[PDB]
């Protein structure tokens, strides 16, 4: 039939991110069909608004909720809808119901997604971000969308969806699994949600070269990638990065020094390379990150040393700074200076983590009021939660 | 590669996600990544590895011998990751070290390509 080709046709186009183009088919198919079915005639209207709302989600400029609505109303009625007078047949209304029930389940789909999305930049804010229950909600929203839209029909727009959600949650296991330490599931999580991402970025190259193709030799801008895309992709880099920090003793194991710094530098941010120069600018005695393996000496041992191994006689000044200054330190936001005169050493303590511990520790007189070390914990600590991206996500 | 086929029809395997379902995604691995994973293990244990290989590549074995237990991966290029015991499998360290050492061979080259 003619009006199964045109929905396929449209949301193969929604499937390439042509939420224009579709928009202008579904336009053209209804002014061309106005003595057609009613039902017909709401099911392209209803499309033109889903696609609308399918551009400005993949915008993310609602950081959408009364379109998503009116969407869902609108695929009710035509579902509900089943006028005989229109004259089409009656597979053909079938049909039309069914697609309408399944794309009323996208926009509810849809709605929820966006309330997430709305939920994780209002907790952007916050010092510390929990992701064990962003990931549960994510998986929970997913098992009660799972196989609503099934449709074959709507088969490029599902495959959009899910490639893309399972994706945000293949993001939140991993900063579950960087903040327990986890290094084989967060590395799982970030290979799966770079495979995602590439997936993603192939069917935006389809998009562009149809695009080059339809607009000649002229050199037309490239078809840029959605909000969402560019902000998946930011906070997959930054999630690659932090298990590059946390993990760069394992990594270095595996190859040389010069490798591993090159390998490093390539990370965005490169938390080792600016630790390393602060260390040699400032001078410090010792740099070191401990996690907290307590319910998991020994039981707070420095994850990543720099620039040598975890001096060993610092660690009990360490323990004790760590456990007088606890309530400080689960602030998470301050910063605890102590300075022992029995060694004359100087430690500055951060806790960007409540399992994660930040120690810069030298071997001279160094006043708290020094505003040089603290800002840079303080950038340390901000760089690893984090909230940046989800502020601009 | 004959013999390894005949004398495989004659012993017991068992797939790494029968053991630890977490190994389990390790069996959707691409077939460049199964590739990448033989060479890191030859790489790491060349005494201990065995490859056979078909004169077109189409197939690929590579075997960690530990004698009578070993790590078989098979990839058909035109994957498998099982590992084999001349005996039934007993209802014992020695297995349990030489999967975690592979484990951590596959863990070391999934974690190459991310970076």
Redesign the interface.
Known sequence: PVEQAVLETFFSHLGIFSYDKAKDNVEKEREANKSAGGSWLSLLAALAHLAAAEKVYHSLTYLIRTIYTSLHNELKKVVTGRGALGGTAPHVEELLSHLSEQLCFFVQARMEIADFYEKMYTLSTQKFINAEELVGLLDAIMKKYSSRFHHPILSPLESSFQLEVDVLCHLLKAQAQVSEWK??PS??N??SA?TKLQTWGQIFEKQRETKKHLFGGQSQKAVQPPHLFLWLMKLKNML?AKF?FY?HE??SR?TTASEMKT?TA??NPDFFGKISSFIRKYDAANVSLIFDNRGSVDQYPAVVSLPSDRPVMHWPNVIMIMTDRTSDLNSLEKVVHFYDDKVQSTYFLTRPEPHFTIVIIFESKKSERDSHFISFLNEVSLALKNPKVFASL | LAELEELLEAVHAKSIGDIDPQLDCFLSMTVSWYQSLIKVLLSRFPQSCRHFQSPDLGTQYLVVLNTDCFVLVFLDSHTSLTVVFREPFPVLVSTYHHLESVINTACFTLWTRLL
């Open positions: 290094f084989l590395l799982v970030l290979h770079h690659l590059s993990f394992a990594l595996q390998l390539k990370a």
